[PDB]
Every structure is written in C-alpha cells, then in structure tokens.
Amino acid sequence: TGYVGLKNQGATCYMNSLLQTLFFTNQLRKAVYMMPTEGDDSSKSVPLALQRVFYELQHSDKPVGTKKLTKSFGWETLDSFMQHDVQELCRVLLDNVENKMKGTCVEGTIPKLFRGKMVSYIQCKEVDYRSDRREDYYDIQLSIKGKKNIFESFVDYVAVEQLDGDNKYDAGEHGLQEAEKGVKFLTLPPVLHLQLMRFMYNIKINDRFEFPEQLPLDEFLQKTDPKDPANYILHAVLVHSGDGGHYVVYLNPKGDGKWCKFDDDVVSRCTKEEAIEHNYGGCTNAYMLVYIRESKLSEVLQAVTDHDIPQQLVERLQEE
Amino acid sequence: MQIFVKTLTGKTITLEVEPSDTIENVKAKIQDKEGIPPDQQRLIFAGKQLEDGRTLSDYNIQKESTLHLVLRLRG
C-alpha cells in the first residue's frame, strides 16, 4: 500500500479513521508540523501528539499508536474503549487545534481549509418584512431519508421552507407572522466535509444513498464565480458499520483515483467500486464524506517530505 | 429570542430561548418541541459543538441564528 495503518487501542476506530483523514489532508499536516511545540508537556499538548502521530504515519513501517494523543486529551485508558462518533471528535478536535494555532505562524489554516459561509433568507408572506443571517460552517449536515443521492440532498437543503403555525417567524413590530425561509451557500471551502444524517429517532438510516466521484455544487451557491467553478472531487469515505459499531476510512490520498482502505492496522489497496458504490448502503455505509475543491487539490494535496518537518521537532520526537 | 434549530429531517423549527440559557436548557426546549431526549442531542453552530455548561451568549448566538441538531453513530 505504501501507507501505514494505526493501532486500535480498543475502540479508537473513530480516531484512527479521522487521524488518517486529517493526515492525508496534506496542507493541514504541513501546518501541524510547523506549530511551535517547545516540548510543552507531551501528555498536555494536543498539537505535539498530532505531530507525533503524523510524523510516524509518514515514516514508520509498522502500525502507529494513539496512546499519547488520547493522553493529551485528558483521557484515562478506559476512555480508549468507549465507542464514539467520528464527526463529534472532528468538531471537538479541529476546534481545539484551531485555537491552538492562533498567534503562531499557522493562524487561519483550519478555517482557510474547512470554513464556508451560508446565507439564510426570511420573508413574511402577509406583511412586508425581510431578514438575512450569514453563518460560518465547518461541515454540512445532509438529510438522507427519502433522498436517493447527494444531488437531491443539496436540493432539499436549499429548498424553501414555510415557517408556519407552531413555527411562525418573529417579525418584530409585526409580531409572529407566517414566512418563507431559504438557505444558500455564499462560499464552499477547499475541503468539503459532509455529514450524512444516517439517523432517525437511534434507529440509524441504512438506506441506499449514492454519492459521486465528482460533484458540481455551482447550483447551490448564491453567486457562482467563473474564475473558480465549484467542482469537488471525492477524497475520503468514512464508513461506519453497526447501529455501537466499527469505523473505517476509504481514501484516494493523491486525488488520482487509486484508492486504499484503512481498517485500523490494516491498509489495503482496493477499487473505486469498493470505496464509492459499495458504500451507498441499503449495516455498512458512508457516514461522513470528504470532497476537495478541484481548483485547490494541488495545494491541499501537495506532497510532503522530510523538508516539511522542522528539525527542532525531529530532535524532540527522536529523543523521546 | 427566537432562534432556529434544523432538525434530523432538515426542517427548521423555531425555538424560544434566552442569552442566559445553558446548552442543557436549550436541549430541553428541543426535547419539549421535537421529543429528542437531551442525552442524545449534539448541536452544531459555526462548526462548534456546544458544550453542556456554557450558555448561548458565550457563542454570540442571537435572534435568527440557526442550530443544527445531530445524533451519534458510535464506533
């Protein structure tokens, strides 16, 4: 495979699957490497742990461990055997690193890679009153039940809703009033993180939901830009199996389309069919999807060498 | 104030909340309107998952802000 896997401490399937995803997001990994970690206190520094884990996934010829990283979380070894949601970790972990990157040479990285903005439009139906709200996002929750594929999922997302009845809009001086609400994307980030809502109330929606290897999302912007069309290429499929369960990540790291499967310590080659179509579901299916913006793939997935790992870090890591 | 909560169906429901409210207070109002037991709610705003203990003011959450409700797939 050319790539190393990661040891399962017990239930760290979620972490290993994300650690691989965040590792192969090369621009992030370079950024983690360039973080000022003066050795701090190891069992206290999440960036140091991320640098350890990232360094060995780049160099080791045997499965890498996660002990120190879960240590740096403030966790005991029993917490390593509770099962967890991969997207909750990502929210918690990337928020951690984002603030730990402030005031250092790598401020802005996580939002520059992952953060987009959306606009919510609200207009009253029986009074002249309109409102707007612009909110940033690091991920998109896509509905699944009743939608055959990702295209129908963004249509629903941007569809127009009726704020009615027990959900009338608080139109200020006009009081509670019926209204229409609509969402649009102002910007989509270089690395798109899609959380498929494979859950109804936990029942877990195992239905067939199809995602593609290319995704044109220009239809869901507010203003399209012809100097950077919004085509995204599929990079990762974080597959969940269960109801608790197991987590695996399928990845074409180089964006070339030669995929591998990452099941904790075992890294396999595999076919497109095995990573995309076999994961539409209908117990095993995609839960999270990583698409990278075609215009930005060269930068995001630029190749990473020992020339990108600061020397002070190697000396810290080696002498340890 | 009236904020917005996108549900597990993707539909926007209105929620009546106070800058004072803690996230457990918000989660209970959601249970009161959507039936989701708080022990299973995960609420996402601007890519932050809101923590039991902090309040809505600590996230600059205000009128017409939108929360995204999500459950867990553990593994």
From Swiss-Prot, chain A:
It comes from the Eukaryota. Coiled coil: none annotated. Hydrolase that deubiquitinates target proteins such as ARMC5, FOXO4, DEPTOR, KAT5, p53/TP53, MDM2, ERCC6, DNMT1, UHRF1, PTEN, KMT2E/MLL5 and DAXX. Together with DAXX, prevents MDM2 self-ubiquitination and enhances the E3 ligase activity of MDM2 towards p53/TP53, thereby promoting p53/TP53 ubiquitination and proteasomal degradation. Deubiquitinates p53/TP53, preventing degradation of p53/TP53, and enhances p53/TP53-dependent transcription regulation, cell growth repression and apoptosis. (Microbial infection) Contributes to the overall stabilization and trans-activation capability of the herpesvirus 1 trans-acting transcriptional protein ICP0/VMW110 during HSV-1 infection. One of its GO terms (cellular component) is protein-containing complex. The active site is at C13 (nucleophile), H246 (proton acceptor). It comes from Homo sapiens. It is found in: Nucleus; Cytoplasm; Nucleus, PML body; Chromosome. This is Ubiquitin carboxyl-terminal hydrolase 7. Induction: Up-regulated in regulatory T-cells (Treg). Down-regulated during neural progenitor cell differentiation. One of its GO terms (molecular function) is cysteine-type endopeptidase activity. One of its GO terms (biological process) is protein deubiquitination. Expressed in neural progenitor cells (at protein level). Widely expressed. Overexpressed in prostate cancer. The C-terminus plays a role in its oligomerization. It is linked to Hao-Fountain syndrome: An autosomal dominant neurodevelopmental disorder characterized by global developmental delay, varying degrees of intellectual disability, autism spectrum disorder, poor or absent speech, and mild facial dysmorphism. Most patients develop seizures. Additional variable features include hypotonia, hypogonadism in males, and ocular anomalies. Isoform 1: Phosphorylated. Isoform 2: Not phosphorylated. Isoform 1: Polyneddylated. Isoform 2: Not Polyneddylated. Residues 4-294 form the USP domain. Changing H246A: Complete loss of activity. Monomer. Homodimer. Part of a complex with DAXX, MDM2, RASSF1 and USP7. Part of a complex with DAXX, MDM2 and USP7. Interacts with MDM2; the interaction is independent of p53/TP53. Interacts with DAXX; the interaction is direct and independent of MDM2 and p53/TP53. Component of a complex composed of KMT2E/MLL5 (isoform 3), OGT (isoform 1) and USP7; the complex stabilizes KMT2E/MLL5, preventing KMT2E/MLL5 ubiquitination and proteasomal-mediated degradation. Interacts (via MATH domain) with KMT2E/MLL5 isoform 3. Interacts with OGT isoform 1. Belongs to the peptidase C19 family.
Curated annotation (Swiss-Prot), chain B:
The modification Phosphoserine is found at S65. Changing S65D: Phosphomimetic mutant that binds and activates PRKN. Residues 1-75 form the Ubiquitin-like domain. Changing H68G: Loss of DTX3L-mediated polyubiquitination of histone H3 and H4. It is found in: Cytoplasm; Nucleus. Changing S65A: Prevents phosphorylation in case of mitophagy. Impaired translocation of PRKN to mitochondria. Exists either covalently attached to another protein, or free (unanchored). When covalently bound, it is conjugated to target proteins via an isopeptide bond either as a monomer (monoubiquitin), a polymer linked via different Lys residues of the ubiquitin (polyubiquitin chains) or a linear polymer linked via the initiator Met of the ubiquitin (linear polyubiquitin chains). This is Ubiquitin.
